[PDB]
């Protein structure tokens, strides 16, 4: 049967636990990303010389 | 002074994700919006699981 789940906010950063133990909002990798409270995942602000 | 009390039903037709409803008023009369509500036809092809 067709099933569907959505992850409202990718705000959990990364987790090093097995995938069966992770929260839906935690990923595996997140490099140069910003976890905003109201804008979700963003690129980190650019490095200004 | 013309003051109304009750419910005003108006058509909001189409996809809920693409319907912007806003209330404008620039008159000298008061407004007291108690609440609102909507009805629509909802269907999902998959279960919440």
């Amino acid at each position: 049967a067709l099933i569907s789940q959505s992850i409202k906010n990718l705000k959990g950063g990364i987790s090093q636990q097995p995938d069966i133990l992770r929260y839906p909002d935690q990923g595996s990798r997140q490099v140069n990303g910003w976890s905003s409270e109201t804008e979700g995942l963003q690129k980190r602000p650019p490095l200004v010389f | 002074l013309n003051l109304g009390t009750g419910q005003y039903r108006f058509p909001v037709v189409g996809n809920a994700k693409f319907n912007t409803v806003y209330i404008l008023s620039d008159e000298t009369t008061p407004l007291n919006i108690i609440g609102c509500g909507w009805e629509g036809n909802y269907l999902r092809r998959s279960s919440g699981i």
Partner: peptide, 15 residues
């Protein structure tokens, strides 16, 4: 009428 997604406040950290 297909079932709805269960409202999960969920959490964070180690589980």
């Amino acid at each position: 009428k297909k079932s709805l997604s269960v409202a999960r406040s969920s959490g964070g950290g180690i589980n």
